Amino acid sequence: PQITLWKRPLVTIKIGGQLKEALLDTGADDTVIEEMSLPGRWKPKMIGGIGGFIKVRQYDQIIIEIAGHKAIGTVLVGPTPVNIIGRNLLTQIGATLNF
Amino acid sequence: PQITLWKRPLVTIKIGGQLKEALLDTGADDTVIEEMSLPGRWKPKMIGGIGGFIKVRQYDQIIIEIAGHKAIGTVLVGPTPVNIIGRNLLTQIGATLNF
Numbered sequence A, B: 001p002q003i004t005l006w007k008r009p010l011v012t013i014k015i016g017g018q019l020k021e022a023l024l025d026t027g028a029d030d031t032v033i034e035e036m037s038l039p040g041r042w043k044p045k046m047i048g049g050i051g052g053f054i055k056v057r058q059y060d061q062i063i064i065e066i067a068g069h070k071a072i073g074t075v076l077v078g079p080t081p082v083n084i085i086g087r088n089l090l091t092q093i094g095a096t097l098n099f
Ligand SMILES: CC(C)(C)NC(=O)[C@@H]1C[C@@H]2CCCC[C@@H]2CN1C[C@@H](O)[C@H](Cc1ccccc1)NC(=O)[C@H](CC(N)=O)NC(=O)c1ccc2ccccc2n1
Pocket: A023, A025, A026, A027, A028, A029, A030, A031, A047, A048, A049, A050, A080, A081, A082, A083, A084, A086, B023, B025, B026, B027, B028, B029, B030, B031, B032, B047, B048, B049, B050, B080, B081, B082, B084, B086
């Protein structure tokens, strides 16, 4: 599938067995998910955006499904306003920007 | 043209007669450029993202070139750490997300 950008590119994801909505974000290096209970070991990290940095929990090797595609990689969990799928997982699902 | 996402999707832009580098950002609603003198009328705005809000100057109807593509639209000028091309201009240059 090919998405225009007239609306936010929101898709369904599954993480921790839960369905959620998230933004496909080519401008994000990392994947940041809103506060949730997620099993697995983690470590503290800061991540930055406009407005400055926030403290998150970094979980490595998390299995996530993104619009039906399975990916495994690092997921950051913390007080983001919007769930973001960034380039570390967009590359694993084969997403590209075309134009 | 197809851009893979193993690295940040940075392109060259021309704005105000000056060349700059900017990120093609499907997760951004708006286009945000670092502090610069830009001629024209503007009005203040606040925009938000991962670390909170920043104040910007909103300029409408700015002529901009993005990776060789002309566009005319709203540019926000303020203390972003990275120049961002968001969906208001990605739709004009014909970008789509393919996965
Ligand atoms: C630019 C504006 C119009 C404000 N839009 C947004 O910021 C919306 C806000 C939405 C709701 C909150 C959750 C994020 C989403 C997506 N974003 C866009 C989104 O694409 C945003 C754009 C951006 C890129 C670079 C630097 C700053 C801002 N990316 C990000 O917020 C990601 C998050 C991350 N760590 O992966 N930041 C970066 O990948 C990133 C890269 C380089 C940096 C250098 C110094 C300082 C900060 C840096 N942040």
